[PDB]
Amino acid sequence: GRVLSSQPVFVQCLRPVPTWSNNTAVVHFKNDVFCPNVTADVLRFNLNF
Amino acid sequence: NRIKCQQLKHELPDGFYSASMLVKKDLPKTFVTMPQFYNWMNVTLHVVL
Amino acid sequence: CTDYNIYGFQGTGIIRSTTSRLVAGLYYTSASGDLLGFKISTTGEIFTVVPCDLTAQAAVINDEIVGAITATNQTDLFEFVNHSTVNTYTMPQFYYITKWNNGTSSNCTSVITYSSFAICNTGEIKYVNVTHVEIVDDSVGVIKPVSTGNITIPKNFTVAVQAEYVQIQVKPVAVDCAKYVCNG
Amino acid sequence: VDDSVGVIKPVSTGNITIPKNFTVAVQAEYVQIQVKPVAVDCAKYVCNGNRHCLNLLTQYTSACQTIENSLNLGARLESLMLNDMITVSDRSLEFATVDKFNTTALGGEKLGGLYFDGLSSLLPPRVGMRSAVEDLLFNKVVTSGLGTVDDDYKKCSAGTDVADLVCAQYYNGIMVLPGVVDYNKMAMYTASLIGGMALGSITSAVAVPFSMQVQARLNYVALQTDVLQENQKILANAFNNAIGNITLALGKVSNAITTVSDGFNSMASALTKIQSVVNQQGEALSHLISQLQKNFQAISSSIAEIYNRLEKVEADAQVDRLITGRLAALNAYVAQTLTQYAEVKASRQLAMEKVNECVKSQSDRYGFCGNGTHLFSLVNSAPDGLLFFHTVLLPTEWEEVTAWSGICVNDTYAYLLKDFDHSIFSYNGTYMVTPRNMFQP
Amino acid sequence: ITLALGKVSNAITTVSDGFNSMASALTKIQSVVNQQGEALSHLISQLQKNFQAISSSIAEIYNRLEKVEADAQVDRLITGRLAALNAYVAQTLTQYAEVKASRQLAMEKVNECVKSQSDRYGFCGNGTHLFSLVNSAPDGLLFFHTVLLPTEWEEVTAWSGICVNDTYAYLLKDFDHSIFSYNGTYMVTPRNMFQP
Numbered sequence: 063g064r065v066l067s068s069q070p071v072f073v074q075c076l077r078p079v080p081t082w083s084n085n086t087a088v089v090h091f092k093n094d095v096f097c098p099n100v101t102a103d104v105l106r107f108n109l110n111f
Numbered sequence: 112n113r114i115k116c117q118q119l120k121h122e123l124p125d126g127f128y129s130a131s132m133l134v135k136k137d138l139p140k141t142f143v144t145m146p147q148f149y150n151w152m153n154v155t156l157h158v159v160l
Numbered sequence: 161c162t163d164y165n166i167y168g169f170q171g172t173g174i175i176r177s178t179t180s181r182l183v184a185g186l187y188y189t190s191a192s193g194d195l196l197g198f199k200i201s202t203t204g205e206i207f208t209v210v211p212c213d214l215t216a217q218a219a220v221i222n223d224e225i226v227g228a229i230t231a232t233n234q235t236d237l238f239e240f241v242n243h244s245t246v247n248t249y250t251m252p253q254f255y256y257i258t259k260w261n262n263g264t265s266s267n268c269t270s271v272i273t274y275s276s277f278a279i280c281n282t283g284e285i286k287y288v289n290v291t292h293v294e295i296v297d298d299s300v301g302v303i304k305p306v307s308t309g310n311i312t313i314p315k316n317f318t319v320a321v322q323a324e325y326v327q328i329q330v331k332p333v334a335v336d337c338a339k340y341v342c343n344g
Numbered sequence: 345v346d347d348s349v350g351v352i353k354p355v356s357t358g359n360i361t362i363p364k365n366f367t368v369a370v371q372a373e374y375v376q377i378q379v380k381p382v383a384v385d386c387a388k389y390v391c392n393g394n395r396h397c398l399n400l401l402t403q404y405t406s407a408c409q410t411i412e413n414s415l416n417l418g419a420r421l422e423s424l425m426l427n428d429m430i431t432v433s434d435r436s437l438e439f440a441t442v443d444k445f446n447t448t449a450l451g452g453e454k455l456g457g458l459y460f461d462g463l464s465s466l467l468p469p470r471v472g473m474r475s476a477v478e479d480l481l482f483n484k485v486v487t488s489g490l491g492t493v494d495d496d497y498k499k500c501s502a503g504t505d506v507a508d509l510v511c512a513q514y515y516n517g518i519m520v521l522p523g524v525v526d527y528n529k530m531a532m533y534t535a536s537l538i539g540g541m542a543l544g545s546i547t548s549a550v551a552v553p554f555s556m557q558v559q560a561r562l563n564y565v566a567l568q569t570d571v572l573q574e575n576q577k578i579l580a581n582a583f584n585n586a587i588g589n590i591t592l593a594l595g596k597v598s599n600a601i602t603t604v605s606d607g608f609n610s611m612a613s614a615l616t617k618i619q620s621v622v623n624q625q626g627e628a629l630s631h632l633i634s635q636l637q638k639n640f641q642a643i644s645s646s647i648a649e650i651y652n653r654l655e656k657v658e659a660d661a662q663v664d665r666l667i668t669g670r671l672a673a674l675n676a677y678v679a680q681t682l683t684q685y686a687e688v689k690a691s692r693q694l695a696m697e698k699v700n701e702c703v704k705s706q707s708d709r710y711g712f713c714g715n716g717t718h719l720f721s722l723v724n725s726a727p728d729g730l731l732f733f734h735t736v737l738l739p740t741e742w743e744e745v746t747a748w749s750g751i752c753v754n755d756t757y758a759y760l761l762k763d764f765d766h767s768i769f770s771y772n773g774t775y776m777v778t779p780r781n782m783f784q785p
Numbered sequence: 786i787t788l789a790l791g792k793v794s795n796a797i798t799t800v801s802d803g804f805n806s807m808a809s810a811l812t813k814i815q816s817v818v819n820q821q822g823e824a825l826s827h828l829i830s831q832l833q834k835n836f837q838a839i840s841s842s843i844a845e846i847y848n849r850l851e852k853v854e855a856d857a858q859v860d861r862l863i864t865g866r867l868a869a870l871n872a873y874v875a876q877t878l879t880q881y882a883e884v885k886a887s888r889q890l891a892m893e894k895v896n897e898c899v900k901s902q903s904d905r906y907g908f909c910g911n912g913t914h915l916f917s918l919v920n921s922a923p924d925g926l927l928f929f930h931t932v933l934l935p936t937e938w939e940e941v942t943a944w945s946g947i948c949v950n951d952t953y954a955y956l957l958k959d960f961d962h963s964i965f966s967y968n969g970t971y972m973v974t975p976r977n978m979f980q981p
């Protein structure tokens with residue numbers, strides 16, 4: 063079916079982690095270094111775990 | 112799009128659709144009462160552990 | 161558009177000032193318990209509460225909001241997402257807002273109809289008058305109660321197909337009474 | 345239990361009874377053809393623009409969707425149907441004036457005739473205004489205790505005065521739309537219909553006298569052989585006295601002494617029905633509006649009061665009973681409305697049959713369009729629908745006459761009448777043949 | 786008609802009034818499919834409204850309270866849900882009686898017009914009925930009335946019978962017929978068509 067919802071899909075800033083390089087970083091919610099000024103609510107950490 | 116999200120359809124038939132706007136967020140307040148001579152108290156709840 | 165708190169009543173709207181005097185109590189409610197107006201006590205003037213966002217009746221033709229049968233004026237419905245020539249007309253009973261200039265459109269293909277006002281493709285509202293016919297009759301098969309005069313008898317003919325729909329069945333539903341009020 | 349003309353006459357070769365003289369009788373009916381449509385905003389009504397409410401209607405956007413589509417797709421079927429039935433011919437509209445029915449005194453008063461006194465109540469004086477009968481009618485809707493139709497909504501969003509009752513309904517998302525056919529088009533539509541009787545020739549502006557119109561409409565029942573001037577009088581005087589007793593029942597003004605007929609009983613069926621029709625539209629809404637003060641087991645009947653006492657994690661439970669309570673209040677209103685849309689759709693279906701078969705055509709279905717054999721029918725406007733005036737035939741005298749149904753000569757040749765409705769009979773030593781409808785030998 | 790339906794035909798651009806007959810249908814068929822999936826889904830979704838009780842499921846109630854006091858809580862579920870049926874039932878019997886008028890209408894249109902070329906003016910179309918073809922549709926029929934339409938006329942002086950030498954009268958047997966001269970030749974025709 064279909065449904066309405068308030069979902070987190072407003073992608074401010076996409077940070078593609080490469081598979082090979084270094085699977086370790088930090089992510090700040092408020093004003094990180096990889097994204098200039100902005101502050102988000104969720105980190106959707108998308109993966110094939 | 113707000114009409115479409117209220118209609119649950121990606122395409123609308125042409126016609127008349129009751130639409131409005133989300134109003135605002137910040138509004139200046141307004142408080143009117145019967146005029147009275149001011150007698151204002153200041154009671155605080157104080158918890159010390 | 162403010163947020164009021166007037167004598168215990170509460171809500172949002174637009175407050176104006178008027179020149180009309182009523183010899184009565186403090187405020188004036190509707191039939192639904194909403195504020196319509198109220199009287200300042202220190203003076204005599206009364207004010208009027210109007211809600212901030214009235215409804216509208218926006219008309220869409222093919223994935224585009226053409227115009228809005230609105231009531232106020234400059235309600236937006238056209239403006240922006242990031243970051244025009246938005247006209248405003250005046251019907252007898254409502255305003256009307258569409259970015260088309262009352263110049264030389266003179267062509268629009270599809271209409272959305274209502275009682276005396278149909279809105280065509282380029283925002284142009286036409287006034288729907290009553291359909292004029294030659295004679296309110298289809299002069300064959302009916303009674304022809306005229307003789308011995310200069311009568312008019314039809315010579316040539318053509319056909320015209322007019323389709324109708326008639327609904328003859330509904331899908332029946334058998335409802336168990338006992339299962340529904342308690343699932344076993 | 346019959347009106348012995350126009351019906352089947354399944355008796356031959358006996359002492360049959362054939363009617364001689366005739367009179368008319370007018371019986372009025374009412375048919376309601378439209379309802380004033382209402383466009384209801386679903387989202388405004390359950391919460392008057394509150395921001396925290398609309399994040400809780402997302403659970404119930406299925407229920408809110410059907411309520412709008414139940415009302416529009418019932419209303420849109422009206423305007424598509426009504427705009428394809430109401431047609432005004434401007435040629436015949438210029439014959440509906442009562443001055444046209446008086447100005448043709450060449451020879452006789454042609455475009456009126458002996459029926460002029462009754463028709464003076466039905467036709468408008470100038471081209472475009474209501475006639476005498478509707479003026480009596482529309483003095484029984486405002487004096488019924490109601491009446492406003494020119495609802496401007498530009499005045500509603502101004503704040504010049506304290507709000508009108510009508511503008512207060514608009515603030516809660518309830519739009520009383522204008523009538524899909526106003527009073528003026530109904531006045532034009534019915535006046536175009538009566539002009540079809542005075543007009544027969546398109547490309548000649550001369551018009552037929554109305555006495556020729558009735559004399560023609562007698563022939564379709566039975567072929568009139570000999571016509572007399574006395575027959576015109578008794579039809580006309582009974583016609584004009586029928587309209588006066590109609591007019592006296594309406595607004596208590598006519599020129600008579602005291603008369604208790606049964607045309608009141610046709611009229612009392614109408615005046616009860618028209619009285620109810622104006623008394624729905626102002627009452628379903630005012631019941632629906634007044635359900636915005638029933639706090640359905642909650643704190644207060646206004647939503648912005650609730651969000652200024654409680655926090656959002658617990659105020660949602662309180663405002664949930666407002667939502668589900670008010671959403672049921674719409675379905676109580678919607679199902680009452682779709683009752684009326686489907687009920688009118690039967691009556692509007694009935695009005696197309698009565699306009700086409702009887703106002704335009706002198707139908708021969710017995711009993712339909714009045715009571716007895718139909719001669720003609722005149723219409724007038726009314727509050728939301730038409731008001732018919734069926735004119736039926738009525739016999740008064742009869743003829744005890746022995747009959748046969750064919751000749752056998754010298755027991756060799758048989759002869760049968762080609763028409764079965766005809767019958768053969770001797771008449772003061774002379775054998776004649778007549779239909780069994782009228783005594784037209 | 787075909788161009789209005791599924792936007793495929795072989796033409797250029799035509800704005801007729803057969804759309805206005807067709808738009809009456811396509812609105813109506815669109816509503817008919819949009820009832821049956823919506824009265825039930827409203828009725829089903831009233832099994833989550835705990836009508837002033839603990840929870841919207843019954844077996845939750847009997848696993849918190851004892852039978853002497855759980856009956857009062859489940860009583861509001863019963864009388865609440867029994868009203869939810871009568872809201873559904875009365876909406877249904879509205880439609881059964883409404884269809885019974887339309888199905889009554891369909892027997893008249895099938896018998897008098899599809900099979901018989903009825904002569905009631907205005908019924909089965911608009912004007913004089915020639916024939917009518919039907920097709921299936923979602924829950925009901927779709928008619929195609931074919932009516933007559935005149936285009937030209939004949940300004941003609943008329944009479945309705947002959948009196949010869951002021952002795953004998955003659956009247957036309959059919960009243961619909963009428964007598965008239967036609968380029969110096971007297972003919973007789975019905976007043977329906979020009980068939981002299």
Ligand SMILES: *[C@@H]1O[C@H](CO)[C@@H](O[C@@H]2O[C@H](CO)[C@@H](O[C@@H]3O[C@H](CO[C@H]4O[C@H](CO)[C@@H](O)[C@H](O[C@H]5O[C@H](CO)[C@@H](O)[C@H](O)[C@@H]5O)[C@@H]4O)[C@@H](O)[C@H](O[C@H]4O[C@H](CO)[C@@H](O)[C@H](O)[C@@H]4O[C@H]4O[C@H](CO)[C@@H](O)[C@H](O)[C@@H]4O)[C@@H]3O)[C@H](O)[C@H]2NC(C)=O)[C@H](O)[C@H]1NC(C)=O
Pocket residue numbers: 292293294295297298299428429431434911912934935
């Ligand atoms: C049910 O049955 C009835 C009976 O069969 C059918 O009724 C017939 O319907 C047709 C079509 O509606 C009628 O034909 C004519 O319709 C014309 C309007 O359509 C347009 O074309 C005209 C030009 O001909 C345009 O002017 C119109 O444009 C409109 O918009 C402008 C604004 O820009 C306005 O100013 C206009 O007024 C229009 O609103 C449309 O594009 C209509 O104009 C035409 O008019 C006749 O009568 C008027 C009265 O004054 C005359 O002035 C005009 O000249 C026409 O008079 C006759 O003489 C000319 C000779 O030049 C003939 O060629 C015409 O045929 C006509 O006899 C006319 O009304 C038709 O009349 C009507 N009745 C019959 C017996 O056919 C219904 O269709 C059918 N369905 C329904 C639902 O009723």
Ligand SMILES: *[C@@H]1O[C@H](CO)[C@@H](O[C@@H]2O[C@H](CO)[C@@H](O[C@@H]3O[C@H](CO[C@H]4O[C@H](CO[C@H]5O[C@H](CO)[C@@H](O)[C@H](O)[C@@H]5O)[C@@H](O)[C@H](O)[C@@H]4O)[C@@H](O)[C@H](O[C@H]4O[C@H](CO)[C@@H](O)[C@H](O)[C@@H]4O[C@H]4O[C@H](CO)[C@@H](O)[C@H](O)[C@@H]4O)[C@@H]3O)[C@H](O)[C@H]2NC(C)=O)[C@H](O)[C@H]1NC(C)=O
Pocket residue numbers: 109110
């Ligand atoms: C963690 O694991 C998950 C699970 O494996 C990983 O997720 C998987 O990701 C896969 C892609 O990386 C996805 O695989 C397919 O995606 C296809 C879409 O892209 C295809 O098409 C483009 C180009 O298309 C153009 O041409 C085609 C025709 O040739 C047209 O149809 C297009 O419109 C364009 O014009 C190519 O460039 C790509 O290479 C792909 O070909 C799908 O199309 C595809 O399968 C579809 O068909 C199947 C039947 O054969 C059907 O079962 C399946 O559902 C697909 O059908 C979908 O799409 C069609 C398109 O018309 C639509 O009509 C159907 O309704 C339906 O939408 C594959 O889906 C995997 O599906 C996805 N999960 C699976 C099941 O493996 C994830 O990546 C991983 N995360 C990591 C490791 O990063």
Ligand SMILES: *[C@@H]1O[C@H](CO)[C@@H](O[C@@H]2O[C@H](CO)[C@@H](O[C@@H]3O[C@H](CO[C@H]4O[C@H](CO)[C@@H](O)[C@H](O)[C@@H]4O)[C@@H](O)[C@H](O[C@H]4O[C@H](CO)[C@@H](O)[C@H](O)[C@@H]4O)[C@@H]3O)[C@H](O)[C@H]2NC(C)=O)[C@H](O)[C@H]1NC(C)=O
Pocket residue numbers: 584585586587588589592598599600603605
């Ligand atoms: C509602 O309906 C009723 C029922 O018809 C109407 O009442 C009729 O009113 C008319 C007009 O007053 C009456 O007609 C007149 O009858 C007079 C004679 O009546 C007497 O004699 C007859 C027998 O001949 C008796 O049956 C009757 O009881 C009386 O004793 C005539 O003198 C009148 O004709 C004269 O004037 C006319 C012009 O007005 C000329 O045409 C004639 O040449 C003549 O000089 C006349 O026709 C009728 O009798 C009444 N009917 C009944 C049953 O009483 C109401 O008028 C009507 N209400 C309205 C219209 O508002």
Ligand SMILES: *[C@@H]1O[C@H](CO)[C@@H](O[C@@H]2O[C@H](CO)[C@@H](O[C@@H]3O[C@H](CO[C@H]4O[C@H](CO)[C@@H](O)[C@H](O)[C@@H]4O)[C@@H](O)[C@H](O)[C@@H]3O)[C@H](O)[C@H]2NC(C)=O)[C@H](O)[C@H]1NC(C)=O
Pocket residue numbers: 153154155
């Ligand atoms: C309601 O009553 C409250 C209780 O008194 C009021 O709070 C008081 O607000 C005043 C504002 O001037 C404060 O005075 C300031 O104090 C700060 C430093 O605060 C600290 O040091 C003081 C020393 O006296 C100590 O009392 C405080 O508790 C803190 O440790 C100074 O820097 C300012 O210059 C100024 O002197 C009071 O200190 C404060 N009292 C408390 C107990 O919080 C409150 O304002 C009242 N609200 C109203 C009237 O609306």
Ligand SMILES: *[C@@H]1O[C@H](CO)[C@@H](O[C@@H]2O[C@H](CO)[C@@H](O[C@@H]3O[C@H](CO[C@H]4O[C@H](CO)[C@@H](O)[C@H](O)[C@@H]4O)[C@@H](O)[C@H](O)[C@@H]3O)[C@H](O)[C@H]2NC(C)=O)[C@H](O)[C@H]1NC(C)=O
Pocket residue numbers: 309310548550942
């Ligand atoms: C019913 O239809 C009849 C047939 O059309 C109508 O008769 C026609 O009436 C018109 C009235 O405008 C006449 O036209 C007029 O003709 C005169 C001249 O007529 C005289 O001279 C001509 C030769 O030029 C001669 O043929 C005639 O016999 C007369 O001696 C003009 O001066 C006028 O401007 C106008 O054009 C027709 O002549 C006439 N035709 C016939 C055969 O009588 C009749 O009037 C219609 N009735 C109605 C509408 O009520």
Ligand SMILES: *[C@@H]1O[C@H](CO)[C@@H](O[C@@H]2O[C@H](CO)[C@@H](O[C@@H]3O[C@H](CO[C@H]4O[C@H](CO)[C@@H](O)[C@H](O)[C@@H]4O)[C@@H](O)[C@H](O)[C@@H]3O)[C@H](O)[C@H]2NC(C)=O)[C@H](O)[C@H]1NC(C)=O
Pocket residue numbers: 358359746
């Ligand atoms: C159908 O209608 C026919 C025409 O009215 C009926 O025929 C009539 O039947 C009645 C029966 O009551 C007869 O009236 C009776 O007359 C006799 C005397 O008749 C004899 O004498 C007279 C002269 O005095 C003479 O004229 C006759 O020829 C007879 O020789 C009385 O004794 C009775 O009291 C009664 O008044 C009519 O005479 C008769 N008329 C004709 C022309 O035959 C017929 O009966 C009807 N059929 C039915 C109702 O089934």
Ligand SMILES: *[C@@H]1O[C@H](CO)[C@@H](O[C@@H]2O[C@H](CO)[C@@H](O[C@@H]3O[C@H](CO[C@H]4O[C@H](CO)[C@@H](O)[C@H](O)[C@@H]4O)[C@@H](O)[C@H](O)[C@@H]3O)[C@H](O)[C@H]2NC(C)=O)[C@H](O)[C@H]1NC(C)=O
Pocket residue numbers: 287289290434470471472532
């Ligand atoms: C929508 O349809 C309406 C109904 O058809 C239109 O109203 C009509 O507007 C026309 C414009 O031509 C009017 O025609 C009139 O002609 C008269 C002449 O009549 C005068 O003389 C007669 C007696 O001979 C007298 O009875 C009249 O009162 C006049 O004194 C002009 O005087 C008028 O001004 C006007 O030109 C129609 O009469 C009028 N119909 C009605 C019933 O009102 C309306 O205009 C249409 N709107 C559109 C098309 O936008």
Ligand SMILES: *[C@@H]1O[C@H](CO[C@@H]2O[C@@H](C)[C@@H](O)[C@@H](O)[C@@H]2O)[C@@H](O[C@@H]2O[C@H](CO)[C@@H](O[C@@H]3O[C@H](CO)[C@@H](O)[C@H](O)[C@@H]3O)[C@H](O)[C@H]2NC(C)=O)[C@H](O)[C@H]1NC(C)=O
Pocket residue numbers: 446447464
């Ligand atoms: C129907 O028409 C008649 C007569 O027709 C009128 O006169 C013709 C000559 C034409 O010009 C027609 O176009 C015109 O309409 C109207 O009759 C009027 O009747 C009244 C009496 O009912 C007469 O009034 C009287 O006049 C005399 C003096 O002559 C006075 O003593 C009286 O006080 C009284 O006023 C009136 O003169 C007469 N009108 C004319 C024009 O002669 C009739 O009113 C009309 N019916 C309607 C409009 O309903």
Ligand SMILES: *[C@@H]1O[C@H](CO)[C@@H](O[C@@H]2O[C@H](CO)[C@@H](O[C@@H]3O[C@H](CO)[C@@H](O)[C@H](O)[C@@H]3O)[C@H](O)[C@H]2NC(C)=O)[C@H](O)[C@H]1NC(C)=O
Pocket residue numbers: 083084086
């Ligand atoms: C995982 O790998 C990433 C690189 O892919 C490491 O981040 C990088 O760390 C190096 C130092 O080892 C940084 O280089 C230095 O950066 C500073 C920034 O001020 C600069 O001044 C120095 O001159 C030098 O360039 C590098 O910037 C940084 N970012 C990169 C290159 O992506 C990360 O530390 C590794 N995580 C581990 C080892 O846990």
Ligand SMILES: *[C@@H]1O[C@H](CO)[C@@H](O[C@@H]2O[C@H](CO)[C@@H](O[C@@H]3O[C@H](CO)[C@@H](O)[C@H](O)[C@@H]3O)[C@H](O)[C@H]2NC(C)=O)[C@H](O)[C@H]1NC(C)=O
Pocket residue numbers: 097098099
């Ligand atoms: C995120 O946004 C903030 C602003 O809200 C950025 O801070 C801004 O940084 C720039 C660059 O340093 C400042 O401009 C500088 O101005 C001085 C003169 O005053 C000039 O000499 C420098 O060369 C430069 O042009 C700007 O003033 C400053 N704004 C504020 C209000 O702090 C911040 O850099 C952004 N971060 C990113 C890049 O994501």
Ligand SMILES: *[C@@H]1O[C@H](CO)[C@@H](O[C@@H]2O[C@H](CO)[C@@H](O)[C@H](O)[C@H]2NC(C)=O)[C@H](O)[C@H]1NC(C)=O
Pocket residue numbers: 232233234248
């Ligand atoms: C209705 O629309 C018009 C066009 O937007 C607005 O026009 C003027 O707005 C200015 C704002 O100060 C006023 O001072 C003028 O008096 C307005 N003119 C009028 C009468 O339209 C107008 O604001 C809108 N409605 C109103 C009454 O403000």
Ligand SMILES: *[C@@H]1O[C@H](CO)[C@@H](O[C@@H]2O[C@H](CO)[C@@H](O)[C@H](O)[C@H]2NC(C)=O)[C@H](O)[C@H]1NC(C)=O
Pocket residue numbers: 364365572574575578740741
């Ligand atoms: C029944 O019809 C006859 C024939 O039309 C009427 O008889 C005429 O009546 C008038 C009186 O109004 C007399 O002046 C005529 O001489 C009668 N003619 C004949 C041939 O008898 C009779 O009046 C009608 N009956 C009623 C009750 O009106």
Ligand SMILES: *[C@@H]1O[C@H](CO)[C@@H](O)[C@H](O)[C@H]1NC(C)=O
Pocket residue numbers: 266267268
């Ligand atoms: C309307 O017609 C004009 C000329 O007839 C044409 O140039 C214009 O493109 C048309 N509008 C459309 C097709 O939207």
Ligand SMILES: *[C@@H]1O[C@H](CO)[C@@H](O)[C@H](O)[C@H]1NC(C)=O
Pocket residue numbers: 968
């Ligand atoms: C009338 O008839 C004559 C002879 O039959 C013929 O010459 C003339 O053309 C006819 N008139 C017409 C057809 O208008």
